[PDB]
Amino acid sequence: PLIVPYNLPLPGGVVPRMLITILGTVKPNANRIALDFQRGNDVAFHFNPRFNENNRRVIVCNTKLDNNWGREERQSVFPFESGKPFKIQVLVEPDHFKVAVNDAHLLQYNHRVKKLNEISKLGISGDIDLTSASYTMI
Template sequence: MRVPFDLPLQTGLVPRFLITIVGTVNPNPSRFSLDFKKGHEVAFHFNPRFNEDNRQVIVCNSMIQNNWGKEERTAPRFPFEAGKPFKIHVLCETDHFKVAVNDAHLLQFNYRLKNLNEITKLSIAGDISLTSVTPAMI
């Protein structure tokens, strides 16, 4: 699957909607991102950065009316490695996104855009190759 990759979410998001993303981090990566979008707005930006000021960090944010909000950098660890496979689960809960990587909980991000059904696209970009992107209800 080519990156950048867009997954249309025809009916929008709902609680208990799960997206599983399987892929491999490229050699010598800089960053990659998952963006859950409502039109041009970004409801949830998940952005692992491999070398920001000589540190590895995961930045989460949203962009509403062309303005980025306050960055959240609270992930307790950085579970991605250059050249290694990964599996990301993003689960929509009633008031937040829950993210797990390689079957271990990583972080949650409270909804800033409240109308989940209006979030109709997942865009994936950056220094990864994708094996699969699978939506499901659980």
């Protein structure tokens, strides 16, 4: 198992047609997962499944610039289940990050940080056992 939090360098940043695949298992009684695509200290794309926000499960997405969070984008479709193995695929497209979970499209997140070649880290954090984190070009 990989250490969590996990730092996956993305050399030279991201580019359209780059596919990032995260395989893991959600812990029992999970509270949160986070993927953080970072441009230095900024978070270009934060993808944050919350298992218990006011007793509801929701995905919160946002960007952090100069240490300030922006407007949240929320997805109530929630494909993660405590205790179960998952696959997150993040496909970089020209205008957005496209996220599929367990081979089913979940959401798109329009690029707010525009210097894709500077988004050169993926952090993976939260209540998972992490099996693999990798990328490839499609």
